[PDB]
Every structure is written in structure tokens, then in C-alpha cells.
């Protein structure tokens, strides 16, 4: 499937969206920008 998810982009220095398939992958994978940023934002 095509889920709108968030990941921390090192070259942007902030979280950014990406399409997630729904299974597998890694943990740089967040359902909201806010949750992404609380884990990765500083």
C-alpha cells in the first residue's frame, strides 16, 4: 500500500514525508511529523 509517513532527513535537518508500503522497513518511520520530531529533532 501507500501510506503517508514521516522520516528524519539528515540533509534537511528535520522530518520529511515519504511513502511507506505498510510492512517491513526500519524505525525511521513515524505516523506524524510531531512524533518524528520528538524522537529525532534534537
Amino acid at each position: 500500500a501507500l501510506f503517508f509517513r514521516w522520516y528524519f532527513d539528515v540533509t534537511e535537518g528535520k522530518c520529511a514525508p515519504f511513502v511507506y508500503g505498510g510492512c517491513g522497513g526500519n524505525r525511521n518511520n513515524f505516523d506524524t511529523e510531531e512524533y518524528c520530531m520528538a524522537v529525532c529533532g534534537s
Binding site: 500500500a1 539528515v10 508500503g21 510492512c23 517491513g24 522497513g25 526500519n26 518511520n29 524522537v39 529525532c40
Partner: peptide
């Protein structure tokens, strides 16, 4: 360290 990993669409894409 998880924050430096590449975005992975995974195999259900």
C-alpha cells in the same frame, strides 16, 4: 542513530 537510517518503503510497496 535510527534517525540517520534511510527511508525504507519496505516490501509491501
Amino acid at each position: 542513530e535510527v534517525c540517520s537510517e534511510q527511508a525504507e518503503t519496505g516490501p509491501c510497496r
